[PDB]
Amino acid sequence: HAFKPGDLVFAKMKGYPHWPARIDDIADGAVKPPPNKYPIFFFGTHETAFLGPKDLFPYDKSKDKYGKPNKRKGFNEGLWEIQNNPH
């Protein structure tokens, strides 16, 4: 798999900017998560969704293009978390 639990990323959902996030472990409450897809935790807002690799940008490579402040609520908080408290 391209990603594993604990890897940091910018995750992209329709209607939102490329958002600081991480790959979580699969919840024990969930039913099997599809082959192509990952459980994402978004820093700042602390939402989850399932997303595929086309929407996941490794954090290191990508921080120059995406890791900059944003007006959307929770984003700058999220930036802080990904650097300083990624758990």
Side-chain angles (χ1 to χ4, degrees), residues 1-31 33-35 37-60 62-64 66-70 72 74-87:
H1 287 284
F3 293 98
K4 70 192 177 310
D7 287 349
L8 302 180
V9 295
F10 292 90
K12 189 56 178 72
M13 296 194 56
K14 180 216 77 171
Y16 306 86
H18 287 81
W19 199 289
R22 59 171 190 228
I23 312 302
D24 268 355
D25 283 286
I26 320 290
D28 68 348
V31 213
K37 304 298 211 296
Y38 298 94
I40 309 307
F41 180 85
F42 297 91
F43 293 116
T45 55
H46 291 180
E47 289 154 310
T48 57
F50 275 13
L51 289 173
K54 82 191 155 69
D55 292 319
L56 297 189
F57 298 83
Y59 163 67
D60 300 292
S62 318
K63 43 172 301 198
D64 60 4
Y66 301 125
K68 80 221 303 176
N70 200 286
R72 298 292 270 287
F75 194 99
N76 307 335
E77 172 144 35
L79 294 166
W80 183 84
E81 277 178 350
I82 195 164
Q83 297 194 98
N84 297 301
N85 203 14
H87 313 160

mmCIF file of all heavy atoms in Angstrom, residues 41-70, unseen atoms left out:
data_model
loop_
_atom_site.group_PDB
_atom_site.id
_atom_site.type_symbol
_atom_site.label_atom_id
_atom_site.label_comp_id
_atom_site.label_asym_id
_atom_site.label_seq_id
_atom_site.Cartn_x
_atom_site.Cartn_y
_atom_site.Cartn_z
ATOM 1 N N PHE A 41 -7.855 11.157 9.251
ATOM 2 C CA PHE A 41 -8.156 12.130 10.278
ATOM 3 C C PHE A 41 -7.605 13.497 9.869
ATOM 4 O O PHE A 41 -6.413 13.656 9.677
ATOM 5 C CB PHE A 41 -7.537 11.595 11.575
ATOM 6 C CG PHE A 41 -7.755 12.496 12.775
ATOM 7 C CD1 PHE A 41 -8.932 12.406 13.525
ATOM 8 C CD2 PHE A 41 -6.790 13.429 13.145
ATOM 9 C CE1 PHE A 41 -9.136 13.248 14.617
ATOM 10 C CE2 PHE A 41 -7.005 14.271 14.225
ATOM 11 C CZ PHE A 41 -8.178 14.183 14.957
ATOM 12 N N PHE A 42 -8.501 14.485 9.751
ATOM 13 C CA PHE A 42 -8.155 15.866 9.491
ATOM 14 C C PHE A 42 -7.863 16.612 10.792
ATOM 15 O O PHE A 42 -8.762 16.805 11.613
ATOM 16 C CB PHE A 42 -9.365 16.542 8.830
ATOM 17 C CG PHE A 42 -9.762 15.961 7.486
ATOM 18 C CD1 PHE A 42 -10.683 14.929 7.390
ATOM 19 C CD2 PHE A 42 -9.214 16.476 6.305
ATOM 20 C CE1 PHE A 42 -11.033 14.401 6.150
ATOM 21 C CE2 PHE A 42 -9.542 15.931 5.075
ATOM 22 C CZ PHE A 42 -10.468 14.912 4.996
ATOM 23 N N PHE A 43 -6.633 17.115 10.928
ATOM 24 C CA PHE A 43 -6.220 17.984 12.007
ATOM 25 C C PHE A 43 -7.027 19.276 11.994
ATOM 26 O O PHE A 43 -7.521 19.658 10.932
ATOM 27 C CB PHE A 43 -4.734 18.287 11.824
ATOM 28 C CG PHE A 43 -3.844 17.058 12.007
ATOM 29 C CD1 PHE A 43 -3.095 16.569 10.946
ATOM 30 C CD2 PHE A 43 -3.733 16.445 13.239
ATOM 31 C CE1 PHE A 43 -2.340 15.414 11.093
ATOM 32 C CE2 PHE A 43 -2.920 15.306 13.402
ATOM 33 C CZ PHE A 43 -2.206 14.820 12.331
ATOM 34 N N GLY A 44 -7.128 19.914 13.172
ATOM 35 C CA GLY A 44 -7.867 21.175 13.317
ATOM 36 C C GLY A 44 -9.365 20.966 13.584
ATOM 37 O O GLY A 44 -9.851 21.330 14.644
ATOM 38 N N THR A 45 -10.087 20.416 12.594
ATOM 39 C CA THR A 45 -11.506 20.104 12.697
ATOM 40 C C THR A 45 -11.681 18.713 13.289
ATOM 41 O O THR A 45 -12.639 18.480 14.000
ATOM 42 C CB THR A 45 -12.167 20.205 11.332
ATOM 43 O OG1 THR A 45 -11.402 19.340 10.499
ATOM 44 C CG2 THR A 45 -12.179 21.631 10.795
ATOM 45 N N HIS A 46 -10.738 17.798 13.044
ATOM 46 C CA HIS A 46 -10.806 16.487 13.678
ATOM 47 C C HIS A 46 -11.908 15.593 13.082
ATOM 48 O O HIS A 46 -12.345 14.657 13.731
ATOM 49 C CB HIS A 46 -10.998 16.634 15.191
ATOM 50 C CG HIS A 46 -9.817 17.180 15.892
ATOM 51 N ND1 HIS A 46 -9.814 17.378 17.252
ATOM 52 C CD2 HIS A 46 -8.577 17.509 15.459
ATOM 53 C CE1 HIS A 46 -8.624 17.855 17.625
ATOM 54 N NE2 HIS A 46 -7.858 17.949 16.542
ATOM 55 N N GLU A 47 -12.345 15.888 11.854
ATOM 56 C CA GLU A 47 -13.260 15.060 11.092
ATOM 57 C C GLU A 47 -12.545 13.821 10.545
ATOM 58 O O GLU A 47 -11.323 13.823 10.387
ATOM 59 C CB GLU A 47 -13.702 15.890 9.885
ATOM 60 C CG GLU A 47 -14.620 17.041 10.264
ATOM 61 C CD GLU A 47 -14.602 18.206 9.306
ATOM 62 O OE1 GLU A 47 -13.464 18.583 9.054
ATOM 63 O OE2 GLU A 47 -15.654 18.757 8.864
ATOM 64 N N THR A 48 -13.322 12.804 10.147
ATOM 65 C CA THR A 48 -12.764 11.717 9.360
ATOM 66 C C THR A 48 -13.512 11.567 8.043
ATOM 67 O O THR A 48 -14.612 12.089 7.866
ATOM 68 C CB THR A 48 -12.801 10.423 10.151
ATOM 69 O OG1 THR A 48 -14.195 10.376 10.412
ATOM 70 C CG2 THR A 48 -11.984 10.499 11.421
ATOM 71 N N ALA A 49 -12.829 10.923 7.092
ATOM 72 C CA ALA A 49 -13.444 10.347 5.915
ATOM 73 C C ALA A 49 -12.498 9.274 5.403
ATOM 74 O O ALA A 49 -11.393 9.138 5.931
ATOM 75 C CB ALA A 49 -13.706 11.378 4.870
ATOM 76 N N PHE A 50 -13.016 8.472 4.477
ATOM 77 C CA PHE A 50 -12.267 7.501 3.700
ATOM 78 C C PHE A 50 -11.892 8.162 2.381
ATOM 79 O O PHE A 50 -12.729 8.814 1.752
ATOM 80 C CB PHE A 50 -13.153 6.278 3.452
ATOM 81 C CG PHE A 50 -13.198 5.217 4.540
ATOM 82 C CD1 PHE A 50 -12.684 5.443 5.808
ATOM 83 C CD2 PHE A 50 -13.785 3.981 4.277
ATOM 84 C CE1 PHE A 50 -12.723 4.448 6.777
ATOM 85 C CE2 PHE A 50 -13.811 2.985 5.245
ATOM 86 C CZ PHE A 50 -13.260 3.219 6.486
ATOM 87 N N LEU A 51 -10.621 8.064 2.015
ATOM 88 C CA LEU A 51 -10.135 8.687 0.789
ATOM 89 C C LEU A 51 -9.118 7.764 0.130
ATOM 90 O O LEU A 51 -8.479 6.951 0.782
ATOM 91 C CB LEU A 51 -9.507 10.057 1.034
ATOM 92 C CG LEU A 51 -10.451 11.198 1.414
ATOM 93 C CD1 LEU A 51 -9.633 12.431 1.794
ATOM 94 C CD2 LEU A 51 -11.401 11.570 0.288
ATOM 95 N N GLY A 52 -9.005 7.914 -1.187
ATOM 96 C CA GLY A 52 -8.044 7.173 -1.980
ATOM 97 C C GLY A 52 -6.800 7.994 -2.312
ATOM 98 O O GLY A 52 -6.785 9.215 -2.164
ATOM 99 N N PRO A 53 -5.740 7.321 -2.820
ATOM 100 C CA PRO A 53 -4.448 7.948 -3.093
ATOM 101 C C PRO A 53 -4.466 9.181 -3.989
ATOM 102 O O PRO A 53 -3.638 10.060 -3.804
ATOM 103 C CB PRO A 53 -3.606 6.788 -3.702
ATOM 104 C CG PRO A 53 -4.628 5.774 -4.169
ATOM 105 C CD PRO A 53 -5.722 5.887 -3.135
ATOM 106 N N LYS A 54 -5.430 9.291 -4.906
ATOM 107 C CA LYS A 54 -5.491 10.449 -5.785
ATOM 108 C C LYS A 54 -5.802 11.726 -5.005
ATOM 109 O O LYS A 54 -5.714 12.823 -5.557
ATOM 110 C CB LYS A 54 -6.526 10.306 -6.911
ATOM 111 C CG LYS A 54 -7.967 10.625 -6.556
ATOM 112 C CD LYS A 54 -8.971 10.212 -7.629
ATOM 113 C CE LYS A 54 -10.351 9.959 -7.090
ATOM 114 N NZ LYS A 54 -10.989 11.199 -6.648
ATOM 115 N N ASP A 55 -6.259 11.570 -3.755
ATOM 116 C CA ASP A 55 -6.660 12.687 -2.916
ATOM 117 C C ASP A 55 -5.697 12.843 -1.732
ATOM 118 O O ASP A 55 -5.940 13.676 -0.865
ATOM 119 C CB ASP A 55 -8.112 12.503 -2.497
ATOM 120 C CG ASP A 55 -9.151 12.626 -3.603
ATOM 121 O OD1 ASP A 55 -9.000 13.537 -4.446
ATOM 122 O OD2 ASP A 55 -10.125 11.840 -3.582
ATOM 123 N N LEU A 56 -4.629 12.029 -1.684
ATOM 124 C CA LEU A 56 -3.646 12.067 -0.624
ATOM 125 C C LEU A 56 -2.267 12.501 -1.138
ATOM 126 O O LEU A 56 -1.690 11.858 -2.021
ATOM 127 C CB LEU A 56 -3.625 10.646 -0.062
ATOM 128 C CG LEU A 56 -4.941 10.164 0.575
ATOM 129 C CD1 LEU A 56 -4.769 8.840 1.289
ATOM 130 C CD2 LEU A 56 -5.532 11.168 1.547
ATOM 131 N N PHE A 57 -1.707 13.557 -0.529
ATOM 132 C CA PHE A 57 -0.433 14.139 -0.918
ATOM 133 C C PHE A 57 0.556 14.032 0.226
ATOM 134 O O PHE A 57 0.358 14.607 1.294
ATOM 135 C CB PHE A 57 -0.659 15.608 -1.211
ATOM 136 C CG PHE A 57 -1.613 15.763 -2.371
ATOM 137 C CD1 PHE A 57 -2.984 15.702 -2.175
ATOM 138 C CD2 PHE A 57 -1.131 15.911 -3.667
ATOM 139 C CE1 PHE A 57 -3.849 15.844 -3.251
ATOM 140 C CE2 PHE A 57 -1.996 16.078 -4.726
ATOM 141 C CZ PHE A 57 -3.348 16.037 -4.516
ATOM 142 N N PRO A 58 1.657 13.269 0.086
ATOM 143 C CA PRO A 58 2.558 13.095 1.223
ATOM 144 C C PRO A 58 3.014 14.474 1.695
ATOM 145 O O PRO A 58 3.284 15.365 0.882
ATOM 146 C CB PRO A 58 3.703 12.229 0.654
ATOM 147 C CG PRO A 58 3.120 11.594 -0.598
ATOM 148 C CD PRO A 58 2.097 12.582 -1.134
ATOM 149 N N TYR A 59 3.106 14.620 3.016
ATOM 150 C CA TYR A 59 3.084 15.899 3.700
ATOM 151 C C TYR A 59 4.361 16.672 3.391
ATOM 152 O O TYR A 59 4.309 17.861 3.072
ATOM 153 C CB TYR A 59 2.900 15.603 5.193
ATOM 154 C CG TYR A 59 3.250 16.774 6.090
ATOM 155 C CD1 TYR A 59 2.481 17.934 6.083
ATOM 156 C CD2 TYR A 59 4.373 16.733 6.904
ATOM 157 C CE1 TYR A 59 2.813 19.017 6.880
ATOM 158 C CE2 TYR A 59 4.713 17.806 7.704
ATOM 159 C CZ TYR A 59 3.935 18.949 7.678
ATOM 160 O OH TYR A 59 4.283 19.995 8.464
ATOM 161 N N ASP A 60 5.474 15.937 3.474
ATOM 162 C CA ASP A 60 6.829 16.434 3.295
ATOM 163 C C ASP A 60 6.996 17.053 1.908
ATOM 164 O O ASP A 60 7.216 18.263 1.791
ATOM 165 C CB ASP A 60 7.809 15.324 3.664
ATOM 166 C CG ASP A 60 7.670 14.862 5.114
ATOM 167 O OD1 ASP A 60 7.998 15.672 6.033
ATOM 168 O OD2 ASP A 60 7.161 13.733 5.320
ATOM 169 N N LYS A 61 6.839 16.216 0.877
ATOM 170 C CA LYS A 61 6.888 16.652 -0.507
ATOM 171 C C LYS A 61 6.006 17.882 -0.710
ATOM 172 O O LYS A 61 6.385 18.756 -1.483
ATOM 173 C CB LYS A 61 6.456 15.546 -1.484
ATOM 174 N N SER A 62 4.863 17.966 0.000
ATOM 175 C CA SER A 62 3.732 18.781 -0.443
ATOM 176 C C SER A 62 3.539 20.048 0.388
ATOM 177 O O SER A 62 2.693 20.884 0.058
ATOM 178 C CB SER A 62 2.464 17.980 -0.390
ATOM 179 O OG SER A 62 2.666 16.665 -0.870
ATOM 180 N N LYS A 63 4.301 20.194 1.472
ATOM 181 C CA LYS A 63 3.975 21.217 2.449
ATOM 182 C C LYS A 63 4.262 22.597 1.886
ATOM 183 O O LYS A 63 3.604 23.556 2.261
ATOM 184 C CB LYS A 63 4.618 21.045 3.828
ATOM 185 C CG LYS A 63 6.081 20.642 3.887
ATOM 186 C CD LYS A 63 6.647 20.703 5.305
ATOM 187 C CE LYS A 63 6.530 22.081 5.913
ATOM 188 N NZ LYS A 63 7.432 22.234 7.060
ATOM 189 N N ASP A 64 5.182 22.673 0.932
ATOM 190 C CA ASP A 64 5.524 23.941 0.316
ATOM 191 C C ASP A 64 4.336 24.480 -0.479
ATOM 192 O O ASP A 64 4.121 25.689 -0.516
ATOM 193 C CB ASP A 64 6.837 23.849 -0.449
ATOM 194 C CG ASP A 64 6.906 22.846 -1.592
ATOM 195 O OD1 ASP A 64 5.878 22.196 -1.897
ATOM 196 O OD2 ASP A 64 8.002 22.704 -2.163
ATOM 197 N N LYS A 65 3.550 23.592 -1.096
ATOM 198 C CA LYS A 65 2.424 24.024 -1.916
ATOM 199 C C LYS A 65 1.145 24.133 -1.075
ATOM 200 O O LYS A 65 0.303 24.980 -1.372
ATOM 201 C CB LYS A 65 2.255 23.124 -3.159
ATOM 202 N N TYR A 66 0.954 23.267 -0.063
ATOM 203 C CA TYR A 66 -0.315 23.252 0.677
ATOM 204 C C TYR A 66 -0.214 23.750 2.120
ATOM 205 O O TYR A 66 -1.223 24.182 2.684
ATOM 206 C CB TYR A 66 -0.910 21.845 0.641
ATOM 207 C CG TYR A 66 -1.151 21.378 -0.780
ATOM 208 C CD1 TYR A 66 -0.612 20.194 -1.222
ATOM 209 C CD2 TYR A 66 -1.849 22.163 -1.691
ATOM 210 C CE1 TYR A 66 -0.812 19.763 -2.518
ATOM 211 C CE2 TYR A 66 -2.046 21.755 -2.996
ATOM 212 C CZ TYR A 66 -1.525 20.546 -3.406
ATOM 213 O OH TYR A 66 -1.706 20.071 -4.671
ATOM 214 N N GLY A 67 0.964 23.606 2.743
ATOM 215 C CA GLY A 67 1.177 23.960 4.136
ATOM 216 C C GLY A 67 1.411 25.460 4.285
ATOM 217 O O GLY A 67 2.542 25.893 4.470
ATOM 218 N N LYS A 68 0.323 26.224 4.152
ATOM 219 C CA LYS A 68 0.297 27.665 4.320
ATOM 220 C C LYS A 68 -1.073 28.042 4.905
ATOM 221 O O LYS A 68 -2.058 27.348 4.679
ATOM 222 C CB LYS A 68 0.629 28.333 2.975
ATOM 223 C CG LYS A 68 -0.499 28.443 1.960
ATOM 224 C CD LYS A 68 -0.156 28.159 0.493
ATOM 225 C CE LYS A 68 0.939 29.006 -0.109
ATOM 226 N NZ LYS A 68 1.279 28.630 -1.489
ATOM 227 N N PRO A 69 -1.188 29.129 5.696
ATOM 228 C CA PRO A 69 -2.448 29.477 6.342
ATOM 229 C C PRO A 69 -3.596 29.600 5.350
ATOM 230 O O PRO A 69 -3.349 29.865 4.164
ATOM 231 C CB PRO A 69 -2.086 30.809 7.005
ATOM 232 C CG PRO A 69 -0.620 30.617 7.310
ATOM 233 C CD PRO A 69 -0.125 30.100 5.986
ATOM 234 N N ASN A 70 -4.813 29.349 5.876
ATOM 235 C CA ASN A 70 -6.085 29.367 5.154
ATOM 236 C C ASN A 70 -7.160 29.992 6.063
ATOM 237 O O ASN A 70 -7.109 29.860 7.279
ATOM 238 C CB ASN A 70 -6.426 27.943 4.705
ATOM 239 C CG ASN A 70 -7.433 27.896 3.582
ATOM 240 O OD1 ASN A 70 -8.622 28.128 3.800
ATOM 241 N ND2 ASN A 70 -6.998 27.582 2.377
#
